[PDB]
């Protein structure tokens, strides 16, 4: 028995009413549970037997059933409900989970603060050079970070990482790391990261001249 969960992700604001649905591939009676999982932690039971609020779960969570369709409702979305939610059937063995629903908090647009870091002298000693561009406290999550070495656009020498949504201000932060050999790093002069984001009227560039 499969569990088709929708949507895969959603964005809603604090206080919004949120609906997550899950369709069982066949009858599963009411043998259905809903779980919440926060980054870095074990899943946590919210609803059991389709509609029963689990002890200690806030009353804004509820579940209901209509045939093969099951629905989790959060009446008033809170900042602390940033998580992935999972539906699960245990009508037959093996029990199966839905594929999850990423819930993020909607907030106003916030432009990133941008910083660029040259490679440390210690790292250059070992023969590698990492250049790090930081985008701090922005929303939405989507952003475009391009590396330019001597005003030439780079391809496939950088990796990105994004933090989870911040608990207070609901923003994201992002790092982009350009990795080069020491020899290649010493052959160029200007290192720049160029940032395009909804919160910026025009792209922001931070740069440095190697050695200066």
């Amino acid at each position: 028995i499969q569990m088709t969960q929708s949507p895969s992700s959603l964005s809603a604001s604090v206080g919004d009413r949120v609906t997550i649905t899950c369709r069982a591939s066949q009858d599963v009676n009411t043998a259905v549970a809903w779980y919440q999982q926060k980054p870095g932690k074990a899943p946590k039971l919210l609803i059991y037997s389709a509609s029963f609020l689990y002890s200690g779960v806030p009353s804004r969570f509820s579940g209901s059933r209509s045939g093969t369709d099951f629905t989790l409702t959060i009446s008033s979305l809170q900042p602390e409900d940033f998580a992935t939610y999972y539906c699960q059937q245990h009508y037959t063995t093996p029990p199966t989970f839905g594929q999850g629903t990423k819930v993020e908090i909607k907030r106003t647009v916030a432009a990133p603060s941008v910083f660029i870091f040259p490679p440390s002298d210690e790292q250059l000693k070992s023969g590698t050079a990492s250049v790090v561009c930081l985008l701090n406290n922005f929303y939405p999550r989507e952003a475009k970070v391009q590396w330019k070495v001597d005003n030439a656009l780079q391809s496939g020498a950088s990796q990105e990482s994004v933090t989870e949504q911040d608990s207070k201000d609901s923003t994201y932060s992002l790092s982009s790391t350009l990795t080069l050999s020491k020899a290649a790093y010493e052959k160029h002069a200007v290192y720049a990261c160029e940032v395009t984001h909804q919160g910026l009227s025009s792209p922001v560039t931070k740069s440095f001249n190697r050695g200066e």
Partner: protein, 212 residues
Amino acid sequence: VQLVESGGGLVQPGGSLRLSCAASGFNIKDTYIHWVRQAPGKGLEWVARIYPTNGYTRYADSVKGRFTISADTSKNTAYLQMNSLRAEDTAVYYCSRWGGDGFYAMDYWGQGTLVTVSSASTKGPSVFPLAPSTAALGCLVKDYFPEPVTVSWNSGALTSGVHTFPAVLQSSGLYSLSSVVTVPSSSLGTQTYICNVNHKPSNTKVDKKVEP
């Protein structure tokens, strides 16, 4: 009620590894005990279950034959013996129970334990400063294996404004991350900033002062 796991870590491909799930505050004789796993960045997958009173077991097809779930009622502990381990088995492993003979679904979960199946050796990180010049500063935590590392600032006295990014796997097979923080510009050169990097799998401890 508590479920406390132990036994994970880094294991060679084709190797063996045994996890334990110790229960407190209830009798495992009364319930089913489950193992559930979560590969990095993926959802939840059921692994196996046991009814300890009679030792009856069920397994997922992907682990049938290779894994053995077992239990010792006099130790109130269940076990997962993993054999012929594959890279596909790398995951956080959770243990759980059918609360209320299933009616309550999986109401209690262990904290999870990370199992990494890889032939790569352990390696501690090099920690390089992300020097400043509101300011941002940080530490590049480069080239370690396996996960995880933890980062703190000034031994936990600096917490607000910190972003420790999720590790990314580099093309070399080693992990890398940065941790950054925003501080007052007026504090540089007199206030002292040290990142505390801990990599328990390699028994590596590094405190790195970041100066402008």
